[PDB]
Design a protein around this ligand. Structure first.
Ligand code: NA
Lengths: 5, 91
């Protein structure tokens, strides 16, 4: 569960 | 481990993804670590050849990422314009 920045 | 300083310039994003956070859902590298971990890097994005999976972010533009929540880390990184100076922990 990664979040793109 | 080592503390590396990298500068990722938004074009128009930093070009990487993060996992972890205090109270978060964990990271694929060290589950006992609630830090923020670089998880995926765009092949030719602004973070390419600069960040790699496993990097532990502990500072972004002078702001410490130790004991930070995921929502706050994503919020801070989206708020920064232009370049984001990162301090990362690399093997
Ligand atoms: Na730990």
């Amino acid at each position: 569960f990664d979040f793109w920045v | 481990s080592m503390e590396i300083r990298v500068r990722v310039e938004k074009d128009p994003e930093l070009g990487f993804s993060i996992s972890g956070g205090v109270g978060g859902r964990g990271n694929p590298f060290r589950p006992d670590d609630d830090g923020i971990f670089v998880t995926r890097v765009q092949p030719e994005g602004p973070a390419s050849k600069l960040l790699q999976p496993g990097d532990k972010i502990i500072q972004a533009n002078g702001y410490s990422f130790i004991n930070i929540e995921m929502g706050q880390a994503v919020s801070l990184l989206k708020t920064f314009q232009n370049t984001v100076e990162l301090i990362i922990v690399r093997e």
